[PDB]
Amino acid sequence: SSERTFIAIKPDGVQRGLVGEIISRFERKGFKLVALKMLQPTTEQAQGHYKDLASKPFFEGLVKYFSSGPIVCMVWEGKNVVKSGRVLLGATNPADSQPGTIRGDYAVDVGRNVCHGSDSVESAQREVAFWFKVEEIA
Amino acid sequence: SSERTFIAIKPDGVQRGLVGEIISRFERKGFKLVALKMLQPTTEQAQGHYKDLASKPFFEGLVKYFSSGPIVCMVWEGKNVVKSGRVLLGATNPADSQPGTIRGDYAVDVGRNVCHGSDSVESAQREVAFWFKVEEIASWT
Amino acid sequence: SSERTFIAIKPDGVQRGLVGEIISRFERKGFKLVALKMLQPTTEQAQGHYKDLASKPFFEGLVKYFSSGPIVCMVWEGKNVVKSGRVLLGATNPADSQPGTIRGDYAVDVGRNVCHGSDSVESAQREVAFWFKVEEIASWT
Amino acid sequence: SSERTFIAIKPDGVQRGLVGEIISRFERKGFKLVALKMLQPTTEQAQGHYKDLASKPFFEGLVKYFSSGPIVCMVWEGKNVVKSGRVLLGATNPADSQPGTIRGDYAVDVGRNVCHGSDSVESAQREVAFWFKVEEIA
Amino acid sequence: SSERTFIAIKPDGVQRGLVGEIISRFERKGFKLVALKMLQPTTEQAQGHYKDLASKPFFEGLVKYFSSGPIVCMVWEGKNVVKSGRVLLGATNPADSQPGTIRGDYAVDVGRNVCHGSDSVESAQREVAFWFKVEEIASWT
Amino acid sequence: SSERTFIAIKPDGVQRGLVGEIISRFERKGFKLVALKMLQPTTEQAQGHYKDLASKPFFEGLVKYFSSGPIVCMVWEGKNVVKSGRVLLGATNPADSQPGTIRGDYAVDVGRNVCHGSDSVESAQREVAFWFKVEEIA
């Protein structure tokens, strides 16, 4: 119930006008929004977000895209919010994403995948701490 | 076109799960979101927000309500966005609000009117400066 | 706030699959559902419902239409719920109805106007007693 | 085509303002609503609804919750309406419920699961007869 | 009831992904779709469409915009469908448009007003003949 | 990215007022509509659409239904639009169609399945060419 997850709507999600849509899907699940802000990520932050792929191909283009414009960062709170958050977004692979999910309804690309969610509670604590100051959290 | 307005979703709007709904209505109109944050207002900020009603007996209930929980602050950018924002929200008094507008669809109280919008370009410049730092405001295309 | 109004979705509203849509619009406004049932009106009930038009030549077509199939009866509770219910429904004549309202979005006929709402607190008290038993009305918070 | 199923929106479903939403999902499937009422279940009825769990744990709290406030009872008619009704609601387990379904979109708990549907035609005939008088059915 | 009107979704409406949304609003009203096509207007057709403004200096920007990409042409059938179509679209100038209407919800420019509707039965008969062949128009129940 | 698929909303889809709904689901996926028209199919065309089933049962009734009224033909363009198009529609079998998909939300029958999508790129090139003239395509 005090569980928290980090959700980030990426620059494509913002440009396509899907910010309210994504938030609505978490509100209607019954999750509690406890932190929220918009910002344009720096290159260093984009690199941090994708640090697991630095030796991986096209890492630069991922980084460029992530910092190509403003994103919206959220912290959602609730039971199983990390795992439920993943389910709401849908499969990482649009060839497997199901309609009813955000990526299923809106995402066509696996890299520009509209939104990000924490893959574990461990990832979430780290991601929340990275993007948010303690004070910004209700 | 570089015009900006301040929109605030109040604690009832947040508690009732209307945050995304309200944002979606501005995105559909074609307005550009350039600042966004959640915060729990201090008593002082709530009082500043309602400063024109400081001598009224319900000034107290407004402030108490406004700071009762987290709110969501936005800055929207676009042509006529200030007046258009008012039109999207609907009449401040839901008893005058038309369905299709946010207050028309969701608000039942004149006090709990879900959200606030700037009444002028002058008010908007003031409200944005009050709630937002220059850095917190984006400039994308 | 303990105020109650009677809302009826008519047979066309039911046949066109608008039952949930209409109920959702009252839930969003923040009104409280306290009675709900489906029934097929008798000729006598339909006539009672339209009693003020009993001397009109289209009284017959109204009654026939009203009892043509099952209707859905509701009682909604909340502040200003009677007048607000009327505003949510829109003008009785869809030719005067504004988009955003139920008749504005869905109704094309002045006769088949999808739904009915009580015109006053007095009418509502009468209509609820006519369509509902005291037991059929809930009292929750 | 004369097949019928029983659907009950539970006290949480009513308080969260989801009554119209759930009905809309059955109307848009093309099912025919033939009985509908709101009532606050008695303790005896709540016990009846959960009779399969009386020797099961926290049975009292389930019963308390079911009768904690008004519910909305429905009878929907159509082909495969029992099985289709289950699919529309989604998996009993929110860790398996899919977005697009009612529980997938709205339910976070497995007990307070927003709504109920008949698990079989046999269960349906019994449930419909229990909650509804023959006269209340169109 | 056999009345018909011409509705056109303009290139901005198509590019912004509002085609289905606009069609859904006419289907909900209960109007009957009897002709539908996508095409990219020629300069000559765009000029014909705006012929009443041929002497105006912004005639050029309208035509350029109207033929900037594919549009979607529709013919809707039903009682009062011409005037009702106008009401569903909302004021031609989004600065007068009410939320609940298409322009009220989506349009920000007086020039880019998303869509067009026939202003009269006379205009509709003319517009349908101009954009559609007799064969392209269905007659179902 | 130049990939195209053929989508046809059938006479039931049009009568139930689902034309805008289906189109909206492709627009929000990010696919590009490049051809669109309404027409009442001839018997010969209905036979062509179902040619794989001519030796199959009730083939006549399928044909009668397909030409029972006006349909809406579309060509959608985008990456994986053929396969994504299938996923958006959902399983051919309503006992397997998932809510969130068009058939999952609206279709109750396997024959009157609301809409049609190309099963392959090969089928798509053929179907597009059959229903559309080159000029009708943007």
Numbering used by the authors:
A (entry chain B), D (entry chain B), F (entry chain B): 2 to 139
B (entry chain A), C (entry chain A), E (entry chain A): 2 to 142
List sentences from the manuscript.
Nucleoside diphosphate kinase (NDK) is a housekeeping enzyme that plays key roles in nucleotide recycling and homeostasis in trypanosomatids. Here we report the crystal structure and spectroscopic characterization of L. braziliensis NDK (LbNDK) under distinct pH conditions similar to that faced by the parasite in the macrophages.
The LbNDK monomer consists of six α-helices partially involving a core of four β-strands arranged in a β2β3β1β4 antiparallel topology order, as observed in canonical NDK structures. As demonstrated for other NDKs, LbNDK also conserves the key residue His117, which is essential for phosphate transfer, Tyr51, important for catalytic mechanism and Phe59 that stacks with the base of nucleotide substrates. Analysis of symmetry-related chains in the crystalline unit cell revealed a hexameric arrangement similar to that observed for LmNDK. The dimer interface (712.4 Å2) is more extensive than the trimer interface (467.9 Å2) and comprises residues mainly from α1 and β2 elements. The Lys30Nζ atom is the main hydrogen bond donor to carbonyl oxygens from Arg104, Gly105 and Ala108 residues, contributing for trimer stabilization along with the Lys80-Asp110 ionic interaction and the hydrogen bond between Arg17 side chain and Arg29 backbone. The trimer interface area of LmNDK, whose C-terminus is structured, is 727.9 Å2 whereas in LbNDK, whose C-terminus is disordered, it is reduced to 467.9 Å2. Besides the probable influence in hexamer stability, the lack of the C-terminus interactions at the trimer interface exposes a surface path formed by Pro12, Asp13, Gln16, Arg17 and the region from Val109 to Arg113 that might be explored for the rational design of compounds to inhibit hexamer formation, considered essential for enzymatic activity.
